[PDB]
Amino acid sequence: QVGIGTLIVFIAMVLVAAIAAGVLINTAGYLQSKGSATGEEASAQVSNRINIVSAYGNVXXXXVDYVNLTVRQAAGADNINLXKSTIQWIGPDXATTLTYXXXXXXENFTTXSIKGXXXXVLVDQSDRIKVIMYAXXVXXXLXXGXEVQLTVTTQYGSKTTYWAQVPESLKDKNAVXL
Amino acid sequence: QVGIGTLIVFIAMVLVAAIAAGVLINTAGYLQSKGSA
Amino acid sequence: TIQWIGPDXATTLTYXXXXXXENFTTXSIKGXXXXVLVDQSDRIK
Numbered sequence A: 001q002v003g004i005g006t007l008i009v010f011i012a013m014v015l016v017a018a019i020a021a022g023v024l025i026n027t028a029g030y031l032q033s034k035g036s037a038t039g040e041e042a043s044a045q046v047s048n049r050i051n052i053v054s055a056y057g058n059v060x061x062x063x064v065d066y067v068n069l070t071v072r073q074a075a076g077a078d079n080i081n082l083x084k085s086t087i088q089w090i091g092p093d094x095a096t097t098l099t100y101x102x103x104x105x106x107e108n109f110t111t112x113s114i115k116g117x118x119x120x121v122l123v124d125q126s127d128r129i130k131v132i133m134y135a136x137x138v139x140x141x142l143x144x145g146x147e148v149q150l151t152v153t154t155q156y157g158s159k160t161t162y163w164a165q166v167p168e169s170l171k172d173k174n175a176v177x178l
Numbered sequence B: 001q002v003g004i005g006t007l008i009v010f011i012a013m014v015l016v017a018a019i020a021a022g023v024l025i026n027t028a029g030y031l032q033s034k035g036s037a
Numbered sequence C: 001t002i003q004w005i006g007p008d009x010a011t012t013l014t015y016x017x018x019x020x021x022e023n024f025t026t027x028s029i030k031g032x033x034x035x036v037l038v039d040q041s042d043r044i045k
């Protein structure tokens, strides 16, 4: 009688242990996948960043109408994608967030390739892509002295602030280095 | 259950480093523009 | 890449192999490679 009851408690012990173990491994599996998720995401948050080589601007009449940004990968970065980035434009007048535009822009920005295959994705360290924003389509065409705070933000999370400072004089200067 | 506690703390250590990691870079970003000007 | 900011045009120059147009070409002055700086004494024009 006692032995029969022990076996019933035994098999119930087996099932309870299996469920407890099953919960343990399944929770471990969830945290393993979650734990793996942050390792790549946080490293891409830290490593993957935009690096701005230069910032020039076209000058028509007497005001800067196009703003040109040449960008590249950071040190030891993965594939930065410039079509999933959102540049922030805090200008002298307006203050909006620029999204990427195809073809084109207006309140959006376009990316033309300078060196490399892709014209929107930085694959290797040597690829350079030019970021195009219409200054006369986001606000008034930038005149002399105007300053723009440009915050390029990667998809994974990065910040490359560049204070595009228009030169104090545009006297007979077709293109100027902001 | 010792491994489960490790995993949650593992995740916490990752963001805490990531939170700390940002501050130097974004501060260096502000000073890189301030120094250049 | 060489960023040319001249009185008129203002573009970024890539590399070619002809003397070019909107590119630049490199001719070795002192050394083996005509495109790669390997030693401290290498000069390429």
Ligand SMILES: *[C@@H]1O[C@H](CO)[C@@H](O[C@@H]2O[C@H](C(=O)O)[C@@H](O)[C@H](O)[C@H]2O)[C@H](O)[C@H]1O
Residues within 6 Å of the ligand: A056, A057, A058, A066, A067, A068, A112, A130, A132
């Ligand atoms: C930033 O890059 C833009 C890439 O399209 C340049 O765009 C061209 O500018 C020319 C001129 O205004 O300089 C126009 O004739 C082209 O149609 C226009 O695509 C822009 O000039 C430059 O600042």
Ligand SMILES: *[C@@H]1O[C@H](CO)[C@@H](O[C@@H]2O[C@H](C(=O)O)[C@@H](O)[C@H](O)[C@H]2O)[C@H](O)[C@H]1O
Residues within 6 Å of the ligand: A081, A082, A083, A084, A120, A121
């Ligand atoms: C860079 O980011 C782009 C953001 O739109 C990606 O764009 C998509 O790419 C898909 C495919 O992988 O080619 C297309 O089916 C989508 O229509 C296109 O928007 C791009 O892939 C990525 O490299």
Ligand SMILES: *[C@@H]1O[C@H](CO)[C@@H](O[C@@H]2O[C@H](C(=O)O)[C@@H](O)[C@H](O)[C@H]2O)[C@H](O)[C@H]1O
Residues within 6 Å of the ligand: A062, A143, A144, A145, A168, A169, A170, A171
């Ligand atoms: C020489 O000094 C002038 C002082 O008035 C400047 O003139 C102003 O320039 C502004 C801008 O910087 O382009 C315009 O918005 C003003 O309307 C204009 O009077 C001039 O620019 C400067 O070179």
